[PDB]
Design an enzyme around this catalytic site. Structure first.
Site, PDB file in Angstrom:
ATOM      1  N   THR A   1      37.813  40.813  41.727  1.00 21.96           N
ATOM      2  CA  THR A   1      38.599  39.834  41.521  1.00 21.96           C
ATOM      3  C   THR A   1      38.156  38.244  40.908  1.00 21.96           C
ATOM      4  O   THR A   1      36.606  38.220  40.910  1.00 21.96           O
ATOM      5  CB  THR A   1      38.180  38.927  43.711  1.00 21.96           C
ATOM      6  OG1 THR A   1      39.465  40.878  43.986  1.00 21.96           O
ATOM      7  CG2 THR A   1      39.028  38.533  43.767  1.00 21.96           C
ATOM      8  N   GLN A   2      39.023  37.178  40.567  1.00 19.41           N
ATOM      9  CA  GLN A   2      39.375  36.593  39.731  1.00 19.41           C
ATOM     10  C   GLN A   2      40.912  35.052  40.012  1.00 19.41           C
ATOM     11  O   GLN A   2      41.111  35.941  41.373  1.00 19.41           O
ATOM     12  CB  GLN A   2      38.525  35.751  38.124  1.00 19.41           C
ATOM     13  CG  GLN A   2      38.438  37.381  37.649  1.00 19.41           C
ATOM     14  CD  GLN A   2      39.793  38.130  37.010  1.00 19.41           C
ATOM     15  OE1 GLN A   2      40.315  38.008  38.228  1.00 19.41           O
ATOM     16  NE2 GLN A   2      39.876  38.557  36.428  1.00 19.41           N
TER      17      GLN A   2
END
Lengths: 243, 233
Positions: free
Chosen positions: B1-2
């Site tokens: 996740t970013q």
């Protein structure tokens, strides 16, 4: 005695006999050459036609690494392919990290260290090939030849396999008669001649000529195979010189 | 996740009688800041395929390197690399689609929406979409981001169904694409005036056009607009 039964064992001479035995597999293989020219390199190889049933032009021996390096070898053909596969992984990781395509001296050491590693242990066998390779980088043209020991040097001309002595003699004449240098198109013609002259050592079965080249002017510094009219022109030149 | 940082907006495209057209503006936004004004977001693969990418630019540059490396790898031990065993649009797409879905399934996506435009060996038009979730679909027109909301309605007036494709010429299709890019410049706050356009035709090949500008803009009526209701001057 028993010093030649296991890889990585020094004999009382200070020799690794298993590596010297790998050289015999190389000497048994077909002839392959390399010629350094003005702005590039030319590679050529003898392909023995064992049978009429072999499809012409299909069993390709010369291999490309990245887009700028050509590799040819004599000896155990699968061992050569294994080495080129590694060479491709080394060139990919270099380009991934540093952006620029791998320089030829850098690439030469990557193969050199990998071949040398297969002389350090008894759990592996040395490579049964001598590999002639090179191309064009930022600093210009480079030709190399790499042995089963891991030993390599830079070359003006290189030759290995069963016809190597014949080829080496012909290459030595070119170096003496062209100190200012040889052109790329000239080197293709001369490469055809040298393979044809070196075929006297494998003269029982007829053969198929295969040439490739990297040149700054003629191929934009990329590795390409010599095909069609330019290949036939080189065959005709070679056929004329033997007669 | 970013989270996406430097971003590219809409990519738009359509089929026409003999091929496909694709376009995207030359901007890399940093939130509301219009940071980078010379970013190429159409990336050709061979002479038959153009991959148009929106979303995160760092992930775009990664994908660009994957495609560059894919061409190198295809050439290895392949005497027909520039002929019958050349990379096809369908091969390039399926590769990207596999990567996109694998990355979402590890909860570490490539934060992009991608349109692969090209022409196949048999002359067939290829146009297909894939995004960060691995979702894929094809249609006579395709667009990402704001282009989905604004460009598709306009492009669908030219090619509303499959049977309209043979009736649409390259001049009509390019005109529709250029107009759509103007509409996006009027209405998308993260767009630019400067853009690139690529045509892949079965006869005339790959035509790549750089440094195009939105032109013939209407702003004159603005002089007559005063206040927000009651103001007369």
């Amino acid at each position: 005695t028993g010093y030649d039964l296991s890889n990585s064992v020094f004999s009382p001479d200070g020799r690794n006999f298993q590596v010297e035995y790998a050289v015999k597999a190389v000497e048994n293989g077909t002839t392959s050459i390399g010629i350094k020219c003005n702005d590039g390199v030319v590679f050529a190889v003898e392909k023995l036609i064992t049978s009429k049933l072999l499809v012409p032009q299909k069993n390709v021996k010369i291999q490309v690494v990245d887009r700028h390096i050509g590799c040819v070898y004599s000896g155990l053909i699968p061992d050569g392919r294994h080495l080129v596969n590694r060479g491709r992984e080394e060139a990919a990781s270099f380009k991934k990290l540093y952006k620029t395509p791998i320089p030829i001296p850098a690439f030469a050491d990557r193969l050199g260290q990998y071949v040398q590693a297969h002389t350090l242990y008894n759990s592996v066998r040395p490579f049964g090939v001598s590999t002639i390779f090179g191309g064009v980088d930022k600093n210009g043209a480079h030709l190399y030849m790499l042995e089963p020991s891991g030993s390599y040097w830079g070359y003006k001309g290189a030759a290995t396999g069963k016809g190597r002595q014949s080829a080496k003699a012909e290459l030595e004449k070119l170096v003496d008669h062209h100190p200012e240098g040889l052109s790329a198109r000239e080197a293709v013609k001369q490469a055809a001649k040298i393979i044809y002259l070196a075929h006297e050592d494998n003269k029982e079965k007829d053969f198929e000529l295969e040439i490739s080249w990297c040149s700054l002017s003629e191929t934009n510094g990329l590795h390409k195979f010599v095909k069609g009219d330019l290949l036939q022109e080189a065959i005709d030149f070679a056929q004329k010189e033997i007669n | 996740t970013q989270q996406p940082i430097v971003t590219g907006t809409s990519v738009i495209s359509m089929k026409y009688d003999n091929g496909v057209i694709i376009a995207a503006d030359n901007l890399g936004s940093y939130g509301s800041l219009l940071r980078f004004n010379g970013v190429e977001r159409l990336i050709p693969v061979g002479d038959n395929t153009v991959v148009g990418i929106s979303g995160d630019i760092s992930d775009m540059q990664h994908i660009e390197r994957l495609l560059k490396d894919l061409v190198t790898e295809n050439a290895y031990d392949n005497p027909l690399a520039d002929a019958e065993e050349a990379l096809e649009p369908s091969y390039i797409f399926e590769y990207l689609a596999t990567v996109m879905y694998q990355r979402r399934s590890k909860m570490n996506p490539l934060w992009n929406a991608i349109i692969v435009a090209g022409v196949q060996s048999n002359g067939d038009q290829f146009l297909r979409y894939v995004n960060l979730l691995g979702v894929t679909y094809s249609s006579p027109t395709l667009a990402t981001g704001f282009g989905a909301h604004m460009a598709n309605p306009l492009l669908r007036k030219v090619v509303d169904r499959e049977s309209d494709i043979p009736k649409t010429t390259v001049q009509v299709a390019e005109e529709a694409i250029v107009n759509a890019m103007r509409v996006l410049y009027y209405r998308d706050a993260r767009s630019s005036r400067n853009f690139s356009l690529a045509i892949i035709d079965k006869n005339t090949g790959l035509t790549f056009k750089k440094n195009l500008q939105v032109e013939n803009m209407k702003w004159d009526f603005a002089k007559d607009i005063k206040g927000y209701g009651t103001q007369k001057i």
